[PDB]
Amino acid sequence: HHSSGLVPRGSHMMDYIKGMTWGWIGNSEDWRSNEAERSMEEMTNLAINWTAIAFQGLQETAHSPDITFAEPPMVTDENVRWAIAKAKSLGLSVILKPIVNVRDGTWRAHINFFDKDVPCEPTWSQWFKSYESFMLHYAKLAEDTGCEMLCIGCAMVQTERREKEWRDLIQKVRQVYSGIITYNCDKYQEDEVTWWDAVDVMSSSGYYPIGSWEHHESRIKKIVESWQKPFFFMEAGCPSRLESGSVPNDWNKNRGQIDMDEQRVFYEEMFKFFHGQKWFYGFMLWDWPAKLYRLEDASENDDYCVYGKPAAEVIKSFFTSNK
């Protein structure tokens, strides 16, 4: 079958991940451009051996059951096959990461339905059927393209209690995708997912504030040892902005207030505490755009991207080191 501990069953293959996320938010026009090719090649200078190909699907509100995918302006199946094959042509292993977003701008962590089925209301059953169609479409693409890993969700906090529905979705994914399955829980939620045993690898969003990494290493170590599964960060990063290090997840904080040093300090601290531990399997960083800004414009860029910034040198020297 599939249940296992520290190492996924041989038929699904644990590598130490040196990764960068590519392509977010997933815009067909961006991925089809010439610039996308230059972007992905430049990303390889971080001395990564993995990339997460990340893109969005959409639902209207946090409480609507229908998810749309692979329609304008979202990525086409051809754009996705292109990105996977290009990555593999550059020597990278691939995590496919389909992520549902909400058109009204609500954070997907609030997607939620009543516990009680009510006749005139949307139900969990209707949303999970729609989510299953979305994730099974990309699980089949992941299989066809040889993606080493599939991430079956990202910080879906207010769905995680629906344990039978998550287990049922995973059983369907297993029937069409034979590689490694992970789920990406949100920051602070590593001990709150009751169904970690149903995936191959645990992962979370490492957006822990400056000054907290030593505490989180100790907290996470105990959680991972209690589950006896491999663990890595499926996202970790910080914008190059004033005070972003105190809330590295907050992509809306202090827009246009540039601070290259804040991003650098975040990375130095994260790598000081998370490195070679036998129970830890590395970093999928956040993030790198399909259309990359000019090196000359990097000192004025307020994004998560490390291209042209001091943090890039911290990452490169960590990923090419003997830790």
Ligand X SMILES: OC[C@H]1O[C@@H](O[C@H]2[C@H](O)[C@H](O)[C@H](O)O[C@@H]2CO)[C@@H](O)[C@@H](O)[C@@H]1O
Residues in contact with its own copies by the rule CB under 8 A: 61-63, 104, 106-107, 109-110, 112, 114-116, 118-120, 157-158, 161, 186-189, 192, 209, 247, 249-250
Q: Does 259 bind ligand X (CB under 6 A)?
A: no
| Beta carbon nearer to its own copies, 79 or 205 | 205
DSSP structure string for 245-271 = GGSTT-TTTTTT-B-HHHHHHHHHHHH
| Beta carbon nearer to ligand X, 227 or 251 | 251
Site for ligand X in 83-112 (CB under 6 A): 99, 101
Site for ligand X in 135-164 (CB under 6 A): 154-155
Which residue of 249, 266, 311, 318 would you call a contact of ligand X, by CB under 6 A? 249
Q: How many CB atoms lie within 10 A of CB 149?
A: 28
Angle, vertex CA 239, rays to CA 21 and CA 43, nearest 5:
35
Site for ligand X in 2-31 (CB under 6 A): 24-25
Decide: helix, strand or coil at residue 279.
coil
Residues 235, 288 contacting (CB under 8 angstroms): no
Site for ligand X in 262-291 (CB under 6 A): 286-287
**Half-sphere exposure in the Cβ direction for 278 (13 Å, CA):** 4
| Beta carbon nearer to ligand X, 12 or 203 | 203
| Beta carbon of residue 287, minimum distance to its own copies (angstroms, whole number) | 19
Residues 87, 94 contacting (CB under 8 angstroms): yes
Mask of contacts with ligand X, 219-238, x by CB under 6 A?
Answer: ----------------x---
Query: Which option in its own copies, ligand X, none does residue 317 bind, with CB closer than 5 to 8 A by kind?
Result: none
Rounded to the nearest 10°, the torsion over CA 170, 129, 192, 280 is 40
| Beta carbon nearer to its own copies, 116 or 278 | 116
Phi, psi of 35, deg, nearest 5:
-60, -30
Q: Locate tokens 């399997």: which residue?
A: 281
| Beta carbon nearer to its own copies, 120 or 255 | 120
Binding residues for ligand X, total number by CB under 6 A? 12
| Beta carbon of residue 122, minimum distance to its own copies (angstroms, whole number) | 11
Decide: helix, strand or coil at residue 21.
strand
Long-range contacts of 112-116 (CB under 8 A, 24+ apart): 112/62, 112/63, 112/158, 112/159, 113/63, 113/65
Query: Which option in its own copies, ligand X, none does residue 104 bind, with CB closer than 5 to 8 A by kind?
Result: its own copies
The answer for 280, left when phi > 0, alpha when psi is -120 to 50, beta otherwise, is: beta
Residues that bind ligand X (CB under 6 A): 24-25, 99, 101, 154-155, 205, 235, 249, 251, 286-287
